[PDB]
Design a binder for these strands. Structure first.
Length: 275
DNA sequence: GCTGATGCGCCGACGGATCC
DNA sequence: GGATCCGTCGAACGCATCAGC
């Protein structure tokens, strides 16, 4: 079945107006993505904060269009030092108070997967979580990475509520992908990755914004393989999330999936917060 | 400089068996 | 015997390196 995101709900449940718009997008190669007019779509979305994963692009190679963004002038970029893979970036209208990279030791383990930005009222973390890999050859690493990440997020020294967004590389429940049964030994839907997502929600604690608003809505995915025309058939996975501290839930106006925006094998997701 | 080949990381279609 | 379960296998993308010219 196809999916149609419901209209944008820009008022919190109790009636406050959204004041912060956050967009997150795994662009699957930032230079490719720009050539496929991804920035055009960002300009129309007009977010206050833009989080990108899988940029596959060091900061020296960033196209000049990214400098013709006056509403997103504070730009922070991260690439791993070894490997054209990974990469993440955070662009904000307003200057954040603090920015950091990695989950504990990035200065020696330069991985380019996590950016932390502190604002007045909240802490934003954007993440590109390591893939368990084909044949699960890196699942144990992911399990160990998951545990270091939980503790890092728990260990934030801020009393400020937390927003965690990006590609978490797991479809939490069966509702979150089109072929749950044929994929339970595939990366992204193993019991191990799913349990780690569950423990993230519980340990931090955090709520799945989209699922909190739409607890029973099936067929809502953020990734489709380029292959076999999966996107046209909406054979996809929900791999990209906005996860909120419990305190931020009354502020939650909506969590969107921008199914129709092309340019990657992931589509954008967008958070509306009334702060 | 430029192209395209190969290498690498990132599952749904298919065929066959089992179940009542 | 239609539905379901299970395992195998090919291949769209982007980017780096490399060979050749």
């Amino acid at each position: 079945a196809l999916y149609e995101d419901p209209p944008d709900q820009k008022t919190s449940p109790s009636g406050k107006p959204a004041t912060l718009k956050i967009c997150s997008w795994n662009v699957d190669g930032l230079r490719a993505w720009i050539k496929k007019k991804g920035l055009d779509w960002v300009k129309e979305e007009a977010p206050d904060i833009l989080c990108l994963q899988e940029t596959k692009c060091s900061e020296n190679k960033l196209p000049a269009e990214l400098q013709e963004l006056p509403g997103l002038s504070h730009q922070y970029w991260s690439a791993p030092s070894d490997k054209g893979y990974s990469g993440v970036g955070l662009l904000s209208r307003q200057c954040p108070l603090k920015v950091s990279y990695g989950i504990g030791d990035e200065e020696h383990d330069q991985e380019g997967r996590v950016i932390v930005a502190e604002f007045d009222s909240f802490v934003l973390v954007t993440a590109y979580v390591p893939n368990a890999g084909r044949g699960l050859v890196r699942l144990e690493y992911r399990q160990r990475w998951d545990e270091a990440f939980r503790k890092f997020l728990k260990g934030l020294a801020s009393r400020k509520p937390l927003v965690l967004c990006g590609d978490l590389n797991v479809a939490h429940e069966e509702i979150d992908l089109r072929n749950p049964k044929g994929n339970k030994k595939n990366a992204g839907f193993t019991p191990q990755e799913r349990q780690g997502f569950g423990e993230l929600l519980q340990a931090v604690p955090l709520a799945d914004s989209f699922r909190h608003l739409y607890p029973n809505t099936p067929y809502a995915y953020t990734f489709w393989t380029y292959m076999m025309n999966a996107r046209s058939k909406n054979v996809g996975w929900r791999l990209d999330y906005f996860l909120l501290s419990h305190s931020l839930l009354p502020a939650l106006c909506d969590s969107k999936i921008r199914s129709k925006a092309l340019g990657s094998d992931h589509c954008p997701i967008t958070l509306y917060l009334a702060l």
